[PDB]
Enzyme design. Structure first.
Site, PDB file in Angstrom:
ATOM      1  N   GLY A  80       0.792  -1.213   0.000  1.00  0.00           N
ATOM      2  CA  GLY A  80       0.000   0.000   0.000  1.00  0.00           C
ATOM      3  C   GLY A  80       0.834   1.278   0.000  1.00  0.00           C
ATOM      4  N   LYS A  81       0.174   2.402  -0.067  1.00  0.00           N
ATOM      5  CA  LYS A  81       0.738   3.736  -0.139  1.00  0.00           C
ATOM      6  C   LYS A  81       0.759   4.354   1.259  1.00  0.00           C
ATOM      7  CE  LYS A  81       0.420   4.921  -4.996  1.00  0.00           C
ATOM      8  NZ  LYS A  81      -0.279   5.846  -5.909  1.00  0.00           N
ATOM      9  N   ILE A  82       0.229   5.545   1.442  1.00  0.00           N
ATOM     10  CA  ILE A  82       0.332   6.244   2.710  1.00  0.00           C
ATOM     11  C   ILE A  82      -0.949   6.104   3.516  1.00  0.00           C
ATOM     12  CG2 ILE A  82      -0.369   8.512   1.878  1.00  0.00           C
ATOM     13  CD1 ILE A  82       1.867   9.678   3.601  1.00  0.00           C
ATOM     14  N   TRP A  84      -2.438   6.773   7.964  1.00  0.00           N
ATOM     15  CA  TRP A  84      -2.247   7.362   9.280  1.00  0.00           C
ATOM     16  C   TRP A  84      -2.755   6.387  10.311  1.00  0.00           C
ATOM     17  CZ3 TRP A  84      -5.687   8.733  13.194  1.00  0.00           C
ATOM     18  CH2 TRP A  84      -5.204   9.554  14.204  1.00  0.00           C
ATOM     19  N   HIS A  85      -2.027   6.315  11.423  1.00  0.00           N
ATOM     20  CA  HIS A  85      -2.458   5.608  12.614  1.00  0.00           C
ATOM     21  C   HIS A  85      -2.421   6.571  13.785  1.00  0.00           C
ATOM     22  CE1 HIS A  85      -1.889   2.067  10.203  1.00  0.00           C
ATOM     23  NE2 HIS A  85      -0.596   2.190  10.118  1.00  0.00           N
ATOM     24  N   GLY A 149      -2.979  -3.313   4.813  1.00  0.00           N
ATOM     25  CA  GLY A 149      -1.661  -3.293   4.158  1.00  0.00           C
ATOM     26  C   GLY A 149      -0.833  -4.363   4.792  1.00  0.00           C
ATOM     27  N   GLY A 160      -0.909  -5.700   8.541  1.00  0.00           N
ATOM     28  CA  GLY A 160      -2.266  -6.051   8.886  1.00  0.00           C
ATOM     29  C   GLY A 160      -3.290  -5.036   8.506  1.00  0.00           C
ATOM     30  N   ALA A 162      -6.153  -1.681  10.001  1.00  0.00           N
ATOM     31  CA  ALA A 162      -6.430  -0.602  10.927  1.00  0.00           C
ATOM     32  C   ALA A 162      -7.872  -0.228  10.811  1.00  0.00           C
ATOM     33  CB  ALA A 162      -5.526   0.603  10.631  1.00  0.00           C
ATOM     34  N   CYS A 178      -3.914   6.005   0.781  1.00  0.00           N
ATOM     35  CA  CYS A 178      -3.882   4.801  -0.042  1.00  0.00           C
ATOM     36  C   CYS A 178      -4.091   5.105  -1.519  1.00  0.00           C
ATOM     37  CB  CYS A 178      -4.885   3.792   0.466  1.00  0.00           C
ATOM     38  SG  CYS A 178      -4.490   3.196   2.103  1.00  0.00           S
TER      39      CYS A 178
HETATM   40  C1  LIG Z   1      -3.008   2.194   1.728  1.00  0.00           C
HETATM   41  C2  LIG Z   1      -2.251   1.872   2.970  1.00  0.00           C
HETATM   42  C3  LIG Z   1      -3.056   1.254   4.072  1.00  0.00           C
HETATM   43  C4  LIG Z   1      -2.149   0.596   5.141  1.00  0.00           C
HETATM   44  C5  LIG Z   1      -2.880   0.050   6.342  1.00  0.00           C
HETATM   45  C6  LIG Z   1      -1.953  -0.605   7.303  1.00  0.00           C
HETATM   46  C7  LIG Z   1      -2.635  -1.302   8.476  1.00  0.00           C
HETATM   47  C8  LIG Z   1      -1.714  -1.874   9.458  1.00  0.00           C
HETATM   48  C9  LIG Z   1      -3.427   0.969   0.959  1.00  0.00           C
HETATM   49  C10 LIG Z   1      -3.243   1.094  -0.544  1.00  0.00           C
HETATM   50  O1  LIG Z   1      -2.455   1.897  -1.059  1.00  0.00           O
HETATM   51  O2  LIG Z   1      -3.962   0.288  -1.165  1.00  0.00           O
END
Ligand SMILES: *[C@@H](CCCCCCC)CC(=O)O
Length: 218
Positions: A80-82, A84-85, A149, A160, A162, A178
């Site tokens: 995935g891309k970006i 926030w947590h 992601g 995992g 979020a 994302c």
């Molecule tokens: C964007 C990133 C989501 C990451 C979530 C991480 C959870 C632990 C997903 C995308 O670019 O499709």
């Protein structure tokens, strides 16, 4: 169908660890330690935690998707891309041995199904938008309540999901989350019109994830 049966290589009980608030890097280190222990013949694990506020970027993140206010970002090795947590978002890190040959899409689909069921159990009608992993509520714009992601290394999962519970959603406005510019991010609290905390959904998320991995979600 694709959701039936088990994705796992070993049918032993998953060790669910309900952790507190854990710095991103510290949790990442623990994920790696647990993954090595699983390859060495140990347990499958599910970490459930909250992170302090942080932006994280997978390798595919593009420069213009980064915070418009210059906030620092942690580069990370999940898909995935970006994103926030932060406080009020339940982060789950399933560290699971998968059966080979791998079917990573099906693993992602099972995480999605788990979180769809959590939403359903709260009376919400969520689902998938094909090609945009995670859990969505339909609308114009469509509203993303959970992100996914993951990465698989040595047939063992990392990273995992979020689930946005009662987090402040303003952090998402500074990024292209994302890679999506035509949608929105939501939370359980915003959808239900009341505060829905992380702690209220911890147990049901754990149960749903463990059930989904072995094909026994109701
Ligand atoms: C964007 C990133 C989501 C990451 C979530 C991480 C959870 C632990 C997903 C995308 O670019 O499709």
């Amino acid at each position: 169908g694709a959701m039936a049966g088990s994705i796992r290589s070993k049918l032993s009980a998953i060790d669910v660890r309900q952790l507190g608030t854990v710095d991103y890097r510290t949790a990442w280190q623990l994920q790696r330690e647990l993954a090595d222990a699983r390859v060495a013949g140990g347990a499958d694990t599910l970490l459930l935690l909250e992170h302090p506020a942080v932006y994280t970027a997978g390798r595919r993140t593009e420069t213009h998707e980064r915070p418009i206010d210059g906030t620092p970002v942690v580069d990370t090795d999940r898909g995935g891309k970006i994103t926030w947590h932060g406080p009020g978002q339940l982060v789950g890190y399933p560290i699971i041995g998968l059966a080979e040959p791998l079917d990573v899409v099906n693993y992602v689909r099972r995480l999605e199904e788990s979180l769809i069921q959590v939403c359903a159990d709260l009376g919400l009608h969520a689902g998938r938008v094909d090609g945009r992993s995670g859990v969505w509520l339909p609308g114009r714009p469509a509203r993303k309540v959970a992100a996914i992601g993951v990465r698989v290394s040595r047939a063992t999962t990392l990273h995992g999901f979020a689930l946005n519970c009662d987090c402040d959603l303003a952090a998402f406005t500074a990024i292209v989350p994302c890679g999506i510019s035509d949608a929105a991010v939501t939370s359980l609290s915003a959808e239900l019109g009341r505060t829905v905390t992380v702690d209220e959904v911890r147990a049901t998320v754990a149960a749903a994830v463990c059930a989904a991995l072995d094909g026994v979600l109701p």
